[PDB]
Paper text:
Genomic DNA adenine methylation within 5’-GANTC-3’ sequences (N = any nucleotide) is an epigenetic mark that controls gene expression in alpha-proteobacteria. Like the mammalian DNA cytosine methyltransferase (MTase) Dnmt12, which is essential for maintenance methylation of hemimethylated CpG dinucleotides at DNA replication forks, the DNA adenine MTase (Dam) in Escherichia coli and cell cycle-regulated DNA MTase (CcrM) in Caulobacter crescentus are responsible for maintenance methylation of GATC or GANTC immediately after replication, respectively.
We used an 18-base-pair oligonucleotide (plus a 5’-overhanging cytosine on one strand and a guanine on the other strand) containing a non-centrally located GAATC site for co-crystallization with CcrM. We crystallized the CcrM-DNA complex in the presence of sinefungin (a methyl donor analog) in space group P212121 and determined the structure to the resolution of 2.34 Å. The DNA-bound form of CcrM contains two molecules (A and B). The dimer interface with an area of ~3100 Å2 is mainly mediated by the MTase domains with two active sites (indicated by the binding of sinefungin) facing opposite directions. The CcrM-bound DNA molecule undergoes dramatic distortions at the 5-bp recognition site while the outer sequences at both ends maintain B-form. Subsequently, four out of the five base pairs within the recognition sequence are disrupted (A2:T2 to C5:G5), with the four bases of the target strand (A2 to C5) being repositioned into new locations and being completely out-of-stacking with neighboring bases. In accordance with the most common mechanism for guanine recognition, Arg44 forms bidentate hydrogen bonds with the O6 and N7 atoms of the G1 base.
Author numbering:
A (entry chain A): 1 to 260, 268 to 357
B (entry chain B): 3 to 38, 62 to 356
DNA sequence: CGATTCAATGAATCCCAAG
DNA sequence: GCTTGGGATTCATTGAATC
């Protein structure tokens, strides 16, 4: 009953949370199974198989079975949460809307939805959808009548900080050395979250010494980040082999003192989308002997051939490479000007 | 249907008046709160989505956009009513409004949901190659960076104030329409507002049907859409998918004369050789079949594209047989 | 050694036209 | 509607293998 700074519990999160005292934790971070509902095998363009999340703990018979599970552990989570505490839940489109409805139905007050913008997600291989390049976190206090939840706005110096105050966080996947390897040399856990995501949650909505509960502990990512930042934690996980890796990982964590951005692309298609050029407009060269027509997707046409400003600009000169930004010009009131001016105009607004 | 249709009234009553399976795409920006209780909003949400699904064609899709206040309500009703989510989209606002209150994170995004009408109707419009071109030749992702609707695009009312509190940017609808419709498709917007969907639809050569209950918003929408310069249809072409090129069976390459029975095909390294058959099959020793089944068998692969795998001898060296398919398509 | 080329992989609801 | 099989499809990053 008298826990230490690190507590790892083997069992089902509903049963184990119900055994904890009520109003006992300052923050809850939940990474529940998403119930991806995958049909079958997916192959990369080189015919190699994707190691998909097909584990038994992500299989649910239906939406209704997932909703009953969701409302059950959320109710147990709300019981052990302190009155001035908060909960974080993460998901993708497969589940985050069902989690969010259950969060609101149980009396939580959603303060923000936070987007985890993945810099290096697995792409869409067949060309059937947009690349699923993000996940969604929900940050909610225990009630809208709650006294005062924790939000370290003045401590983190977030006043007018254009990157900290944003509700979208650009963070890479958990790969490389941080990705814990199992006994077979492969990944130990299929859905391990990057520690950098947990750092932003912990440092913004907890104080040193606070108790963080993770009812889906996995390989102990919440615990490793809490211990490194001077927070106490309680982890619950059903799988014993994940807990073996979590215990060995956390024992190697050295607590630090917590007080201790790539260039974005500007596609030509964005300039046409913004209306700075219209589809059907004409692009000229420096002299005006070569012309191209703008298409709605940022491609351009010369004769019967179409393509990007760089491929077509290279074809119109019979040259290997070409920088279409400096080669193509658009008519203004003062004559021809390179489309690179419009690229700098959109770039300055980003 | 008509290129431009604007209807004054309630979206549930009006959508029920339309014929079934008549619209290709639905874009919905519902109000956050119901009347200017979650139970009331959930019933309203379930009613207009159910009415929208009936009007949608079997191969159509729906877009909804909201904030954290209501998007979970809408997302659950979308899934529950039989829609199948393809993506949720994050509109990252390039220039978000600053939040100096210091109590929450600054609202720098909104969420969109793109879903086909049902799960097993997997034929839906998605112009993958056009959007890849639009994203500098890397495939378009679920995170979109688009500025807020500001400047002269923000429709002003009398006395100079903003006319609509939740007017969406045209560039956002431009990417929606560019990606999930074709020229000629009809787009239904049951929450028209000041006509953002219509202005973008008219620009890209799409029909639209707008429904809005406030007459003051419809006067602004009509005047705004009238000033939209429509792009000529010959300028609405985008990059196409190779899945829609005229199929040239390999049996036609042999019957034409570009390859003869007895010719040998090679892999990239030249270690896998196959002989051409009269009917278009190829043989590797005792194995015989199509250029795709044999190409996969000779390298122990589940699948293979024989057009890029097999090569025929030319004056410059090994050239893929896809070169010969291009010659047939050139004529 | 450094520079250049391969190989691997990540929460994924991932084909579609012809008969 | 179903089945069949042609043939289309990948981004960022890490770390080893090769030159
Ligand atoms: N009912 C349950 N009680 C406890 N743990 C569960 C239960 N159901 C699923 N789990 C586990 O929850 C974990 C879900 C993971 N997404 C968590 C990974 C964790 N965030 C990490 O970074 O390592 C899986 O390891 C499941 O085994
Ligand atoms: N029941 C209803 N039927 C039709 N329109 C409604 C209804 N309820 C609210 N509306 C309107 O729907 C609009 C919701 C807006 N968010 C849409 C704005 C629109 N996307 C724009 O860019 O202008 C508001 O103008 C509402 O007045």
């Amino acid at each position: 009953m008298k826990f230490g700074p690190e507590t790892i519990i083997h069992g089902d999160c509903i049963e184990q949370m119900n055994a904890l005292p009520e109003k006992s934790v300052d923050l809850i971070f939940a990474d529940p199974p998403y119930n991806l509902q995958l049909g079958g095998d997916l192959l990369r363009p080189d015919n190699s198989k994707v190691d998909a999340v097909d584990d038994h703990w992500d299989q649910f018979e239906s939406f209704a079975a997932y909703d009953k599970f969701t409302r059950e552990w959320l109710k147990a989570a709300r019981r052990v949460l302190k009155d001035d505490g908060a909960i974080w839940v993460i998901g993708s489109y497969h589940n985050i809307f069902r989690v969010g409805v259950a969060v609101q139905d149980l009396g939580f007050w959603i303060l923000n939805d936070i987007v985890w913008r993945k810099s290096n997600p697995m792409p869409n291989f067949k060309g059937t959808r947009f690349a699923n390049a993000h996940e969604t976190l929900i940050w909610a206090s225990k009630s809208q009548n709650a006294k005062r939840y924790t939000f370290n706005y003045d401590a983190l110096k977030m006043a007018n900080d254009e990157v900290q105050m944003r509700s979208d966080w650009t963070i890479p996947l958990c790969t490389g050395e941080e990705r814990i390897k199992g006994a077979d040399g492969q990944k130990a856990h299929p859905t391990q979250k990057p520690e950098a995501l947990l750092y932003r949650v912990i440092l913004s909505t907890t104080k040193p010494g606070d108790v963080i509960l993770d009812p889906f502990f996995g390989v102990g990512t919440t615990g490793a980040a809490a211990k490194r930042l001077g927070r106490k934690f309680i982890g619950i996980e059903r799988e014993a082999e994940y807990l073996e890796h979590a215990k060995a990982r956390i024992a190697k964590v050295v607590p630090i003192a917590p007080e201790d951005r790539a260039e974005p692309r500007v596609p030509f298609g964005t300039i046409v989308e913004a209306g700075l050029l219209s589809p059907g407009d004409t692009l000229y060269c420096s002299k005006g002997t070569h012309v191209a027509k703008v298409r709605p997707d940022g491609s351009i046409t010369v004769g019967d051939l179409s393509g990007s400003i760089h491929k077509i600009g290279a074809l119109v000169q019979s040259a290997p490479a070409c920088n279409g930004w400096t080669y193509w010009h658009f008519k203004t009131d003062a004559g021809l000007a390179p489309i690179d001016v419009l690229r700098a105009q959109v770039r300055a607004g980003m």
